[PDB]
């Protein structure tokens, strides 16, 4: 019967499509490794896809995936048990060493570029014509950490020019240098910007940028990694919901 042939053919197609989709999703992270970097014996039933190459614009090279793993930085974690499957503990300071929820990836140390080859993110000082169009303007507010102590003041908003959005707040610290705080990790209130992830004492340890006017993907990953890592690691200094709504 025609409808019978059709549904049989469809399940054959669908089995094929799922094989394609899953192999396609193995272009990053595979081969799988044992907890000490050696190739794991069990690689599962799907093979690696043949390589594809992305030609990256403006002299950024090419990306060929699948390929050798790019991570080669030291990972400061001790094994906790001889058997596979258990946590690997921080050997030093997890926030500083860049492991666990404070991890970062060694992304390219150049800024992300817009379609016209210009820096995507720029301080609003330098972004001609950009201005706060709605909402509480945070520039000028004190920034309070989770220990309810002031860590600095917002001296600018760093803007994504093509998407026209606030990506970071530039915060000036007690010694006069600044750090960038991820916008989606701060709370702009009427008289303050509150950062739940970080106590005041941790603001100086935020990774710095090299140029005052641009941020590289590598810097962004270290900043965002560090700040999110504070939800686990700054938890001792985080005052209660009770203490803060007082």
């Amino acid at each position: 019967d025609l409808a019978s042939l059709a549904i049989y053919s469809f399940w054959i197609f669908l089995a094929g499509l799922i094989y394609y989709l899953q192999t396609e999703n193995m272009r990053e992270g595979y081969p799988l490794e044992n907890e000490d970097g050696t190739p794991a014996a069990n690689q599962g039933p799907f093979p690696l896809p043949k390589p594809k190459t992305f030609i990256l614009p403006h002299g950024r090279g090419t990306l060929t995936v699948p390929g050798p793993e790019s991570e080669d930085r030291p990972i400061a974690l001790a094994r906790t048990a001889v058997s596979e499957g258990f946590p690997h503990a921080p050997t030093g300071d997890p926030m500083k060493d860049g492991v666990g929820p404070a991890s970062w990836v060694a992304r390219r140390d150049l800024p992300e570029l817009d379609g016209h080859g210009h820096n995507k993110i720029k301080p609003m000082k330098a972004a001609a014509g950009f201005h706060v169009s709605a909402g509480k303007n945070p520039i000028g507010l004190p920034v309070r950490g989770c220990d309810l102590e002031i860590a600095g003041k917002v001296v600018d908003i760093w803007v994504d020019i093509p998407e026209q959005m606030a990506r970071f707040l530039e915060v000036e610290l007690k010694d006069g240098s600044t750090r960038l705080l991820p916008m989606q990790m701060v709370k702009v209130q009427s008289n303050r910007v509150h950062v739940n992830a970080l106590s005041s004492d941790l603001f100086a340890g935020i990774p710095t940028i090299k140029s005052p006017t641009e941020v590289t993907l590598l810097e962004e990953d270290k900043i965002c990694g560090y700040v999110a890592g504070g939800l686990m690691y700054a938890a001792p200094k985080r005052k209660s919901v009770v203490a803060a709504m007082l």
Binding site: L32, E33, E71, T80, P94, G100, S103
Partner: peptide, 25 residues
């Protein structure tokens, strides 16, 4: 069996109940 970049994330903590007792993969 870990992805090429996974080891650095497999740290202790994050458990809502029973501390580190069930903290494994």
């Amino acid at each position: 069996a870990l992805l090429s970049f996974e080891r650095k994330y497999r740290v202790p903590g994050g458990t809502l109940v029973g501390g580190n007792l069930f903290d494994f993969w």
